[PDB]
Amino acid sequence: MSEQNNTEMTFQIQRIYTKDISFEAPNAPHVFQKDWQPEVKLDLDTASSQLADDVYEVVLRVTVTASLGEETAFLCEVQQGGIFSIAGIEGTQMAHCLGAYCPNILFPYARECITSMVSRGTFPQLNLAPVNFDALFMNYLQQQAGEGTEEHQDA
Amino acid sequence: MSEQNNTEMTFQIQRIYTKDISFEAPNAPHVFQKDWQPEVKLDLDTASSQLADDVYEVVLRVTVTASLGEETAFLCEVQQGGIFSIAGIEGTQMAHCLGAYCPNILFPYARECITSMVSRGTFPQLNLAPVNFDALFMNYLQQQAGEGTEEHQDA
Amino acid sequence: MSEQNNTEMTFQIQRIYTKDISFEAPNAPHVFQKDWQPEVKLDLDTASSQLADDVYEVVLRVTVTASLGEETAFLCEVQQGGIFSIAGIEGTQMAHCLGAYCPNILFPYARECITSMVSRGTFPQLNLAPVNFDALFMNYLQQQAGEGTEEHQDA
Amino acid sequence: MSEQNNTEMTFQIQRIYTKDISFEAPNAPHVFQKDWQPEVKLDLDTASSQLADDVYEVVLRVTVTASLGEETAFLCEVQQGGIFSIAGIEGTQMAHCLGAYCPNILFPYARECITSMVSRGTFPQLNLAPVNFDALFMNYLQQQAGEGTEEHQDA
Amino acid sequence: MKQSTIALALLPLLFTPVTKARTPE
Amino acid sequence: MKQSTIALALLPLLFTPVTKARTPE
Amino acid sequence: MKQSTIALALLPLLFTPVTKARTPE
Amino acid sequence: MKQSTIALALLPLLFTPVTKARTPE
């Protein structure tokens, strides 16, 4: 993380929307009287469709499982679709745009739709934490170090 | 919304929630080219369970099959369940409580969950018109001893 | 000539929509030290307009205050408006229809919109209580009457 | 200036949340029959906050006004706050962090929180196009060089 | 039923009583 | 700052109803 | 024949709330 | 190790519907 890099990139968000939404609690009566301490098993799956030349749909499947041991608390799956314009860049920069940067746009939409569904099933708030796929792709190609908190205030 | 309250009729809402939610837009960005109000179809299934002494959960599988032109727009199904502390009821009116007034409580929440997922899927909004099905049940029940029921708990 | 019953009537939902939103988390970054169910204060306020005849646009302003201990945590507010076509009926019968029933349709939509802004403020689970607002008037307008179990024993 | 690849400067997100939200459809019942020509004004506000040693919360309040010629369609204003632990390597190096890449963190969330209120206010799909501030600040830091093209000819 | 475009009207079968409404095991 | 749990009160001002929900006159 | 959807531009200030964030032009 | 709530991981294929960006092996 010290790179200059060109922008160029012919990018425009065409339309964002929830293609698929789901929330399952078949144990809903029984699970509400349980002590709330779930093992949140995430799942991240990738999907797309070509609508035209340079017009491509980025879908990211975000699937949140919650299990209080053998008791399944719930399952939730939101597949956030987003139509984006891709041109200008090619190779690993285009791969950065698609496999990190474009579903980063879709991340807060998928996030709110899951946490809403949790609260619709009357389970306590489960907000997804910010995952930088982008910064994880910044990790390769080079060496990765990290400075610590120095703790400095003066007046 | 109401029934024959000539007894010690009890009805204290414990809780409303979603045991199952679904929204499926398979043709989504292709079908958005069809910018108009989709042909919407409502469907119902029965499901419920006894949780405790005079405490009973009622579940309605509300289904919305929507289609733009001659193809699928979105498929939106919510199994809206709700626990109610009910007592002081006898005979066929016990079947009316769960077959009219309890689904009547769940109908605003079913409609809302669907309507929200429609707007999230960026389709033209659709609010289901309120029906007094309670009354239609009463007319039929009060002119027969045919107290029928199905054992169905797939929820 | 004049039977004491809901004569004719006409009810249809035209369009439901969020007209206004407010969220203020004054002590937000610091007050997160306090983890429990925040000290709530809901405050219900009125906003209305008659667009045309037989067409009235009903809003329900749901103001929310939430506090952690001795300080305010967050503030939320939604104005869920809804256009409804109401006709035929007149007097106390329509005073209840717009005074309870129409805002009660809009209550679930406002409810989720609050809990959304709470979730966006990363605050504890804040869900509004399920009330049958129509029943609150209905129990005033009905004479309460029941029956009793009868027995006999001669020793 | 961090000329060598190493990643000396270091970033950790503690928390991201909306500290203020406000949607206003002033003419909402009227605005749906009006001419839909959205002239959307963009207005940026900045808010500073220091929570601790090396714990700095930068906030960006994004304002979106939509006007149908002379009549206001709606307003959507979201104060997107974010607690970011930023330290190790100061000056223009850190200025590219806090004033360029940290905006890019909050910007997807601030987009979505606006888009959500628009969708809840039943208006057509509205997404503000992604602007990579950070790359164009590298353009002034030491120019944009390093044209990569790691290509893969295959389908 | 009378499912209509969007109407409850009448359930496909009489829902349940509070009596048992399930297999007793 | 107050301390409570939800609210919901029967509107003391009532709701502003329809002026003659019969004849567009 | 091309157009562009509404977008932001570079923040004409470059905010520096943190101490020691010296910007020598 | 990650001192954060759950946190996602990178993708085996770099997710590319446009062309197909990856190593040829």
XYZ file of C-alpha atoms in Angstrom:
720
model
C 0.000 0.000 0.000
C 2.072 2.878 -1.516
C 0.993 2.513 -5.208
C 0.124 5.430 -7.552
C -1.883 3.621 -10.339
C -4.099 5.163 -13.105
C -7.904 5.567 -12.778
C -9.369 5.984 -16.313
C -12.138 3.262 -15.904
C -15.503 3.983 -17.630
C -17.771 3.253 -14.649
C -21.435 4.089 -14.047
C -23.937 2.347 -11.716
C -26.893 1.428 -13.940
C -29.216 0.102 -11.148
C -28.943 -1.584 -7.677
C -31.613 -3.896 -6.162
C -32.262 -7.060 -4.136
C -32.673 -10.007 -6.579
C -33.158 -12.529 -3.800
C -34.033 -12.202 -0.096
C -34.706 -14.957 2.469
C -34.900 -15.553 6.235
C -35.669 -18.983 7.805
C -36.432 -19.735 11.483
C -38.429 -23.102 11.535
C -37.418 -23.362 15.235
C -38.687 -19.739 15.807
C -41.031 -20.452 18.915
C -38.458 -22.722 20.643
C -35.359 -20.562 19.927
C -36.734 -17.227 21.374
C -36.633 -18.639 24.958
C -32.899 -19.551 24.457
C -29.881 -17.576 25.770
C -28.680 -15.470 22.780
C -25.083 -16.555 21.980
C -24.891 -17.832 18.304
C -21.985 -19.091 16.206
C -22.404 -16.899 13.094
C -21.331 -19.035 10.086
C -21.017 -16.690 7.057
C -21.049 -17.736 3.393
C -19.908 -15.629 0.424
C -20.810 -16.902 -3.079
C -20.381 -15.195 -6.489
C -22.870 -14.860 -9.439
C -23.321 -12.734 -12.618
C -25.099 -12.287 -15.989
C -24.039 -10.522 -19.234
C -26.797 -8.069 -20.273
C -24.750 -6.488 -23.106
C -21.210 -5.529 -24.167
C -19.533 -3.590 -21.247
C -22.815 -3.964 -19.221
C -22.469 -6.747 -16.612
C -24.478 -7.696 -13.538
C -22.457 -8.160 -10.320
C -24.396 -10.330 -7.816
C -22.917 -11.212 -4.415
C -24.618 -13.890 -2.287
C -24.362 -12.998 1.391
C -25.590 -15.853 3.611
C -25.599 -15.572 7.399
C -26.144 -18.696 9.508
C -26.651 -18.454 13.288
C -26.466 -21.603 15.496
C -26.584 -21.638 19.346
C -24.763 -25.036 19.233
C -27.093 -27.764 17.827
C -30.044 -25.313 17.947
C -30.178 -23.399 14.649
C -31.190 -19.812 15.519
C -31.767 -18.772 11.912
C -30.588 -18.741 8.320
C -30.609 -15.565 6.152
C -29.614 -15.183 2.469
C -29.704 -11.920 0.485
C -28.319 -11.963 -3.084
C -27.670 -8.278 -3.833
C -27.655 -7.598 -7.591
C -26.115 -4.514 -9.155
C -25.739 -3.589 -12.811
C -22.411 -1.773 -13.494
C -20.602 -0.351 -16.584
C -17.057 -1.849 -16.965
C -14.505 -0.472 -19.489
C -11.012 1.150 -19.698
C -9.053 -1.183 -17.348
C -8.217 -4.876 -18.071
C -6.576 -7.729 -16.117
C -6.040 -7.563 -12.315
C -7.306 -3.892 -12.122
C -10.578 -4.949 -13.845
C -10.553 -7.963 -11.441
C -10.198 -5.486 -8.533
C -13.237 -3.541 -9.895
C -15.437 -6.686 -10.148
C -14.186 -8.993 -7.344
C -13.917 -6.300 -4.605
C -14.902 -2.733 -5.558
C -18.330 -3.299 -7.310
C -19.861 -5.686 -4.581
C -18.352 -3.140 -2.061
C -21.027 -0.805 -3.550
C -23.592 -3.618 -2.940
C -22.247 -4.517 0.570
C -24.379 -1.950 2.689
C -27.606 -2.880 0.726
C -27.112 -6.654 1.363
C -26.071 -5.820 4.975
C -29.236 -3.779 5.856
C -31.527 -6.348 4.125
C -30.046 -9.175 6.313
C -30.115 -7.209 9.638
C -33.726 -6.087 8.809
C -34.732 -9.780 8.235
C -33.088 -10.724 11.596
C -35.153 -8.016 13.378
C -38.277 -9.187 11.381
C -37.677 -12.641 12.906
C -37.346 -10.691 16.238
C -33.724 -11.844 16.837
C -31.264 -9.223 18.382
C -29.224 -6.966 16.003
C -26.577 -8.741 13.863
C -24.771 -6.104 11.702
C -22.104 -7.324 9.195
C -18.574 -5.863 9.844
C -16.684 -3.865 7.038
C -14.585 -6.398 5.010
C -12.066 -4.751 2.622
C -11.597 -7.288 -0.254
C -9.800 -4.343 -1.948
C -7.188 -4.015 0.867
C -6.774 -7.838 0.916
C -5.892 -7.609 -2.859
C -3.497 -4.714 -1.950
C -1.726 -7.299 0.299
C -0.339 -9.411 -2.646
C 2.116 -8.117 -5.415
C 4.385 -6.695 -2.561
C 5.425 -6.917 1.132
C 2.822 -6.188 3.906
C 3.867 -4.534 7.203
C 1.914 -2.585 9.832
C 2.765 0.142 12.361
C 1.221 0.042 15.890
C -0.804 2.645 17.831
C 1.769 5.215 19.108
C -0.763 6.957 21.471
C 0.080 10.720 21.192
C -1.937 13.797 22.290
C -0.337 17.202 23.169
C -1.632 20.773 23.731
C -60.778 -7.647 13.356
C -63.675 -8.822 15.624
C -65.947 -11.795 16.543
C -68.785 -12.884 18.927
C -67.438 -11.587 22.288
C -70.215 -12.929 24.605
C -67.806 -14.908 26.849
C -64.542 -14.438 28.890
C -62.678 -14.197 25.471
C -58.931 -13.586 25.979
C -56.425 -12.462 23.348
C -53.085 -10.998 24.502
C -50.480 -10.712 21.743
C -47.176 -12.266 22.867
C -45.099 -11.640 19.688
C -45.166 -11.327 15.809
C -42.248 -12.436 13.606
C -41.145 -14.074 10.363
C -40.467 -17.852 10.375
C -39.877 -17.738 6.628
C -39.291 -14.903 4.159
C -38.575 -15.090 0.435
C -38.215 -12.716 -2.525
C -37.038 -14.130 -5.918
C -36.482 -11.950 -9.018
C -34.956 -14.469 -11.589
C -35.531 -12.310 -14.714
C -34.829 -9.103 -12.635
C -32.734 -6.704 -14.948
C -34.319 -8.156 -18.129
C -37.836 -7.842 -16.648
C -37.201 -4.175 -15.488
C -37.461 -3.247 -19.223
C -41.154 -3.989 -18.493
C -41.614 -0.816 -16.380
C -45.249 -1.177 -15.188
C -47.333 -2.664 -12.305
C -46.766 -6.550 -12.319
C -49.736 -9.000 -12.373
C -49.849 -10.013 -8.679
C -51.406 -13.233 -7.306
C -52.084 -13.927 -3.597
C -52.053 -17.492 -2.144
C -52.489 -18.956 1.411
C -51.416 -22.076 3.379
C -52.275 -23.120 6.965
C -49.704 -23.776 9.736
C -49.771 -23.391 13.550
C -48.647 -24.998 16.852
C -49.541 -25.091 20.596
C -46.591 -23.593 22.576
C -48.139 -23.762 26.085
C -51.389 -23.971 28.104
C -53.811 -21.532 26.328
C -50.719 -19.995 24.556
C -50.850 -20.755 20.822
C -48.840 -19.714 17.718
C -50.694 -18.961 14.427
C -48.768 -18.937 11.065
C -50.058 -17.818 7.635
C -48.023 -18.622 4.524
C -48.786 -15.541 2.432
C -47.571 -15.867 -1.167
C -47.248 -13.236 -3.916
C -46.676 -14.534 -7.468
C -45.880 -11.487 -9.645
C -45.299 -11.476 -13.418
C -44.509 -8.689 -15.945
C -46.075 -9.531 -19.328
C -45.845 -13.340 -19.802
C -42.739 -13.978 -17.576
C -41.893 -13.863 -13.852
C -41.381 -10.435 -12.205
C -40.849 -11.552 -8.571
C -41.886 -14.406 -6.213
C -42.462 -13.066 -2.685
C -43.591 -15.481 0.101
C -43.701 -14.731 3.866
C -44.730 -17.249 6.554
C -45.838 -14.576 9.025
C -46.226 -16.219 12.473
C -47.515 -14.778 15.746
C -47.942 -16.093 19.304
C -51.205 -15.226 21.182
C -52.337 -15.950 24.780
C -55.970 -16.974 24.008
C -58.568 -18.339 26.520
C -62.271 -18.402 27.538
C -63.316 -19.776 24.109
C -65.299 -23.001 23.389
C -66.649 -25.005 20.419
C -66.301 -23.902 16.749
C -65.427 -20.265 17.774
C -61.956 -21.706 18.747
C -61.550 -22.464 14.994
C -62.816 -18.888 14.214
C -60.231 -17.230 16.546
C -57.351 -18.926 14.672
C -59.167 -18.943 11.283
C -60.122 -15.213 11.222
C -58.949 -12.827 14.022
C -55.376 -14.248 14.482
C -54.523 -14.163 10.598
C -56.178 -10.674 10.647
C -53.360 -9.535 13.035
C -50.684 -11.139 10.761
C -52.061 -9.693 7.435
C -50.675 -6.012 7.952
C -47.209 -7.527 8.762
C -47.338 -9.978 5.781
C -48.316 -7.126 3.399
C -45.569 -4.838 4.859
C -42.725 -7.437 4.612
C -43.684 -8.144 0.944
C -44.197 -4.432 -0.007
C -40.767 -3.523 1.509
C -39.021 -6.363 -0.456
C -40.814 -5.164 -3.654
C -39.365 -1.621 -3.231
C -35.921 -3.159 -2.324
C -36.171 -5.234 -5.556
C -37.105 -1.873 -7.215
C -40.452 -3.160 -8.640
C -43.628 -0.871 -8.660
C -45.098 -0.943 -5.096
C -48.187 -3.106 -4.345
C -50.305 -2.877 -1.137
C -52.853 -5.728 -0.662
C -56.420 -4.407 -0.106
C -57.935 -5.212 3.413
C -60.791 -7.831 3.408
C -63.279 -8.610 6.257
C -62.924 -12.407 5.884
C -63.795 -12.649 9.643
C -67.490 -11.978 8.836
C -67.612 -14.487 5.909
C -66.286 -17.196 8.308
C -68.961 -16.335 10.966
C -71.910 -16.643 8.471
C -70.760 -20.167 7.460
C -69.799 -21.400 11.007
C -73.051 -20.284 12.736
C -75.112 -22.462 10.295
C -73.310 -25.841 10.780
C -71.736 -28.122 13.450
C -69.006 -29.010 10.879
C -65.949 -28.147 12.991
C -63.173 -29.310 10.615
C -59.381 -28.815 10.886
C -56.083 -29.877 9.233
C -52.912 -31.036 11.044
C -50.255 -28.924 9.214
C -47.146 -27.411 10.956
C -44.743 -27.009 7.978
C -43.444 -23.540 9.076
C -84.260 4.423 6.602
C -81.109 4.335 8.822
C -79.911 0.927 10.152
C -77.187 1.235 12.890
C -74.453 -0.549 10.850
C -71.482 0.390 8.560
C -73.633 1.365 5.533
C -71.969 0.873 2.080
C -68.427 2.258 2.813
C -65.496 2.207 0.301
C -61.851 1.492 1.270
C -58.822 1.158 -1.037
C -55.075 1.756 -0.493
C -53.807 4.097 -3.242
C -50.092 4.401 -2.261
C -48.011 4.128 0.981
C -44.718 6.055 1.350
C -42.255 7.559 3.812
C -42.856 11.352 3.639
C -40.211 12.366 6.201
C -37.350 10.919 8.321
C -35.187 12.139 11.166
C -32.422 10.361 13.098
C -30.038 12.111 15.533
C -27.509 10.151 17.630
C -26.195 13.101 19.815
C -23.931 11.174 22.251
C -23.435 8.321 19.657
C -19.581 7.451 19.746
C -19.370 7.656 23.580
C -22.808 6.314 24.684
C -21.975 2.905 22.989
C -20.186 2.109 26.336
C -23.734 1.529 27.683
C -25.154 -1.846 26.496
C -28.770 -2.715 27.477
C -32.373 -2.045 26.242
C -32.272 1.858 25.986
C -34.795 4.027 27.874
C -37.465 4.501 25.177
C -39.938 7.365 24.753
C -42.319 7.060 21.791
C -44.357 10.201 20.996
C -47.211 9.972 18.454
C -47.951 13.161 16.442
C -50.545 14.085 13.760
C -50.085 15.184 10.113
C -52.968 15.089 7.567
C -54.297 16.406 4.224
C -57.481 15.876 2.127
C -56.222 15.695 -1.521
C -59.673 15.426 -3.122
C -63.154 14.284 -2.093
C -63.462 10.534 -1.245
C -59.574 10.683 -1.140
C -57.747 11.488 2.119
C -53.998 11.264 2.691
C -53.363 9.981 6.242
C -49.900 10.409 7.852
C -48.796 9.001 11.215
C -45.736 10.757 12.708
C -43.904 8.339 14.975
C -41.317 10.199 17.054
C -38.754 8.081 18.914
C -36.422 8.951 21.758
C -33.984 6.392 23.143
C -31.598 6.953 26.041
C -28.840 5.025 27.839
C -29.006 5.590 31.584
C -28.960 9.320 32.456
C -28.212 10.557 28.881
C -29.805 10.339 25.408
C -28.480 7.535 23.154
C -30.290 8.268 19.864
C -33.396 9.879 18.347
C -35.418 8.520 15.394
C -38.614 9.690 13.643
C -40.664 8.512 10.668
C -43.700 9.987 8.920
C -45.448 7.119 7.164
C -48.044 8.678 4.868
C -50.637 6.775 2.906
C -53.314 7.823 0.444
C -56.646 5.991 1.041
C -59.960 6.257 -0.872
C -62.774 6.308 1.747
C -66.457 6.989 0.891
C -70.114 6.178 1.726
C -69.644 6.189 5.531
C -69.856 9.324 7.751
C -69.666 10.431 11.456
C -68.014 8.350 14.255
C -67.720 5.423 11.786
C -65.165 7.349 9.584
C -63.655 9.122 12.674
C -62.450 5.615 13.735
C -61.481 4.602 10.127
C -58.962 7.501 9.762
C -58.366 7.823 13.558
C -57.125 4.226 14.105
C -57.420 1.913 11.055
C -55.548 3.879 8.286
C -52.545 4.822 10.698
C -52.593 1.113 11.881
C -51.954 0.015 8.218
C -49.028 2.522 8.132
C -47.707 1.546 11.633
C -45.710 -1.668 10.433
C -44.070 0.370 7.566
C -43.020 3.201 10.013
C -41.947 0.518 12.564
C -39.380 -1.132 10.205
C -38.186 2.348 9.040
C -37.324 3.276 12.704
C -35.546 -0.037 13.405
C -33.613 0.500 10.093
C -32.215 3.910 11.274
C -31.478 2.391 14.753
C -29.491 -0.393 12.981
C -27.680 2.253 10.861
C -26.738 4.037 14.114
C -25.349 0.602 15.328
C -27.579 0.893 18.443
C -29.293 -1.957 20.523
C -32.430 -3.772 19.216
C -35.344 -1.257 19.197
C -38.712 -2.802 18.130
C -42.122 -1.110 18.645
C -44.802 -3.040 20.608
C -47.643 -4.725 18.523
C -50.853 -2.894 19.577
C -54.375 -3.393 18.147
C -55.151 0.364 18.097
C -58.684 -0.261 16.706
C -59.447 -2.616 19.690
C -58.696 0.285 22.115
C -61.787 2.112 20.682
C -63.776 -1.148 20.039
C -63.697 -2.190 23.768
C -65.148 1.245 24.700
C -68.006 0.874 22.139
C -69.044 -2.669 23.303
C -70.915 -3.792 26.462
C -68.675 -6.478 28.076
C -70.702 -9.666 28.899
C -69.852 -13.355 29.511
C -71.245 -16.604 30.997
C -70.325 -19.047 33.808
C -69.972 -22.782 34.555
C -73.002 -24.203 36.503
C -73.120 -27.261 38.881
C -75.310 -29.017 41.526
C -74.516 -31.326 44.507
C -76.729 -32.617 47.379
C -74.990 -34.508 50.249
C 6.235 10.111 1.032
C 6.411 6.238 1.325
C 8.289 5.717 -1.994
C 9.011 2.002 -1.275
C 6.411 -0.817 -1.050
C 6.034 -1.829 2.637
C 2.714 -0.434 3.973
C 4.125 1.693 6.842
C 0.801 3.512 7.473
C -1.908 1.276 9.057
C -5.725 1.314 9.201
C -8.298 -0.423 11.454
C -12.051 0.384 11.433
C -13.527 0.345 14.948
C -17.103 1.254 13.867
C -19.272 2.796 11.040
C -22.734 4.361 11.660
C -25.091 7.207 10.766
C -25.030 10.009 13.406
C -27.806 11.953 11.596
C -30.348 11.022 8.861
C -33.101 13.184 7.272
C -35.444 12.468 4.327
C -38.018 15.102 3.277
C -40.668 14.669 0.552
C -42.330 18.131 1.250
C -44.927 17.804 -1.553
C -45.035 13.916 -1.396
C -48.909 13.426 -2.109
C -48.614 16.040 -4.937
C -45.122 15.123 -6.229
C -46.169 11.773 -7.864
C -48.629 13.526 -10.309
C -45.946 16.212 -11.081
C -43.429 16.252 -13.996
C -40.618 13.790 -13.093
C -37.504 15.773 -14.136
C -35.141 15.328 -11.070
C -32.534 18.143 -10.948
C -30.457 16.664 -8.127
C -28.171 19.088 -6.197
C -25.059 17.564 -4.499
C -23.804 19.291 -1.293
C -20.902 18.021 0.906
C -20.392 18.821 4.617
C -17.440 17.690 6.819
C -17.417 16.993 10.606
C -14.297 16.282 12.755
C -14.161 14.243 16.013
C -11.290 12.855 18.185
C -12.465 10.064 20.547
C -9.042 9.003 21.944
C -5.277 8.780 21.278
C -4.937 7.608 17.609
C -8.759 7.081 17.542
C -10.120 9.669 15.097
C -13.684 9.705 13.842
C -14.115 11.467 10.477
C -17.696 12.177 9.386
C -19.060 13.161 5.936
C -22.602 14.599 5.769
C -23.814 14.099 2.150
C -26.863 16.133 1.020
C -29.017 15.144 -1.991
C -31.775 17.583 -3.018
C -34.067 16.678 -5.963
C -35.995 19.518 -7.686
C -38.597 19.150 -10.487
C -37.679 22.455 -12.161
C -38.866 24.839 -9.385
C -40.778 22.393 -7.080
C -38.730 20.238 -4.626
C -39.292 16.496 -5.278
C -37.464 15.354 -2.126
C -34.396 15.801 0.119
C -32.008 13.078 1.431
C -29.231 14.063 3.887
C -27.079 11.499 5.758
C -24.287 12.325 8.245
C -22.220 9.135 7.768
C -19.841 8.839 10.746
C -16.993 6.358 11.054
C -14.555 5.641 13.876
C -11.133 4.920 12.275
C -7.893 4.070 14.149
C -5.332 5.889 11.930
C -1.631 6.351 12.899
C 1.874 5.563 11.729
C 3.251 8.001 9.107
C 1.902 11.608 9.017
C 1.783 14.650 6.645
C 0.390 14.419 3.048
C 0.896 10.620 3.379
C -1.700 10.464 6.228
C -3.705 13.300 4.502
C -4.242 10.906 1.532
C -5.543 8.407 4.148
C -8.007 10.516 6.235
C -9.101 12.948 3.466
C -9.278 10.532 0.478
C -9.464 6.733 1.266
C -11.476 7.151 4.534
C -14.242 9.128 2.533
C -14.203 6.092 0.110
C -15.011 3.855 3.146
C -18.044 5.947 4.274
C -19.269 6.800 0.717
C -20.932 3.314 -0.190
C -22.812 3.467 3.190
C -23.819 7.167 2.712
C -25.000 6.292 -0.854
C -27.103 3.347 0.413
C -28.629 5.231 3.417
C -29.832 7.946 0.948
C -31.007 5.331 -1.652
C -32.915 3.490 1.135
C -34.945 6.617 2.145
C -35.678 7.365 -1.568
C -36.926 3.751 -2.050
C -38.984 3.955 1.225
C -40.356 7.285 -0.094
C -41.465 5.192 -3.162
C -39.357 7.307 -5.638
C -37.481 5.690 -8.685
C -34.003 4.092 -8.210
C -31.314 6.735 -7.445
C -27.547 5.866 -7.116
C -24.765 8.517 -7.003
C -21.866 7.379 -9.318
C -18.555 6.186 -7.528
C -15.732 8.806 -7.459
C -12.186 7.558 -6.596
C -10.859 10.698 -4.804
C -7.736 8.886 -3.494
C -6.238 8.054 -6.947
C -6.552 11.717 -8.106
C -4.871 12.801 -4.786
C -1.953 10.409 -5.683
C -1.932 12.373 -9.001
C -0.811 15.440 -6.944
C 1.190 13.468 -4.292
C 3.643 11.975 -6.875
C 1.511 11.538 -10.093
C -0.331 8.372 -11.318
C 2.153 5.815 -12.795
C 2.401 1.992 -12.712
C 0.326 0.709 -15.655
C -0.349 -2.968 -14.858
C -1.959 -5.342 -17.412
C -1.843 -8.894 -15.965
C -4.063 -10.312 -18.756
C -5.657 -13.795 -19.146
C -7.015 -14.598 -22.669
C -9.633 -17.317 -21.937
C -13.435 -17.779 -21.625
C -61.077 -20.265 -1.576
C -61.777 -16.995 -3.390
C -58.049 -16.091 -3.710
C -58.774 -13.309 -6.263
C -55.941 -11.034 -7.461
C -55.051 -10.121 -3.808
C -57.674 -11.250 -1.200
C -57.810 -13.722 1.752
C -61.641 -14.245 1.564
C -61.751 -17.832 2.960
C -58.916 -20.265 3.942
C -58.401 -23.554 1.825
C -59.513 -25.543 4.895
C -60.761 -24.468 8.409
C -57.469 -23.425 10.088
C -57.180 -25.064 13.593
C -58.961 -25.130 17.030
C -57.000 -24.342 20.264
C -58.025 -27.877 21.489
C -55.127 -30.043 20.125
C -54.344 -28.721 16.592
C -51.495 -31.297 16.415
C -50.644 -34.986 16.832
C -50.481 -35.371 20.739
C -46.810 -36.627 20.717
C -33.760 11.271 28.514
C -37.107 10.213 30.128
C -37.181 6.394 30.788
C -40.169 4.437 29.342
C -40.968 1.502 26.967
C -42.752 2.363 23.641
C -46.030 4.458 24.158
C -49.135 4.468 21.821
C -52.031 6.623 23.158
C -55.595 7.111 21.796
C -55.267 10.498 19.992
C -56.586 13.163 22.567
C -56.816 15.734 19.694
C -58.418 12.881 17.638
C -57.629 12.687 13.893
C -58.761 15.345 11.363
C -61.426 13.302 9.394
C -63.007 13.624 5.896
C -65.338 16.569 5.216
C -68.524 14.800 3.918
C -67.248 11.364 2.655
C -70.361 11.029 0.395
C -70.774 13.957 -2.076
C -67.848 15.725 -3.947
C -69.502 19.164 -3.441
C -23.184 10.180 -28.746
C -22.480 9.588 -24.987
C -23.860 10.873 -21.632
C -22.993 10.472 -17.901
C -25.143 9.931 -14.752
C -24.826 12.394 -11.807
C -21.544 12.111 -9.774
C -19.364 14.008 -7.218
C -15.957 15.685 -7.791
C -12.702 16.145 -5.768
C -13.406 17.794 -2.367
C -12.008 21.413 -2.957
C -10.299 21.679 0.467
C -9.048 18.137 1.320
C -10.096 17.953 5.008
C -7.314 17.237 7.582
C -8.943 16.856 11.118
C -6.020 14.826 12.566
C -2.940 16.514 14.087
C 0.447 16.390 12.220
C -1.435 16.057 8.841
C 0.778 18.831 7.302
C -0.003 19.476 3.586
C 3.026 21.442 2.071
C 1.873 22.735 -1.369
C -6.104 -14.579 13.243
C -8.748 -11.768 12.935
C -9.848 -9.749 16.026
C -13.141 -8.791 14.282
C -16.770 -10.009 13.961
C -16.631 -13.076 11.584
C -15.031 -11.225 8.526
C -15.198 -12.618 4.912
C -12.225 -13.997 2.852
C -10.819 -13.538 -0.704
C -12.231 -15.448 -3.685
C -10.274 -18.422 -5.374
C -11.241 -16.935 -8.779
C -11.041 -13.082 -8.863
C -14.758 -12.906 -10.007
C -14.681 -11.641 -13.639
C -17.923 -11.810 -15.823
C -16.349 -9.184 -18.188
C -13.499 -11.376 -19.536
C -11.689 -13.783 -17.089
C -8.809 -12.362 -14.960
C -6.766 -15.074 -13.179
C -3.457 -16.987 -13.545
C -3.528 -19.420 -16.645
C -2.488 -22.179 -14.156
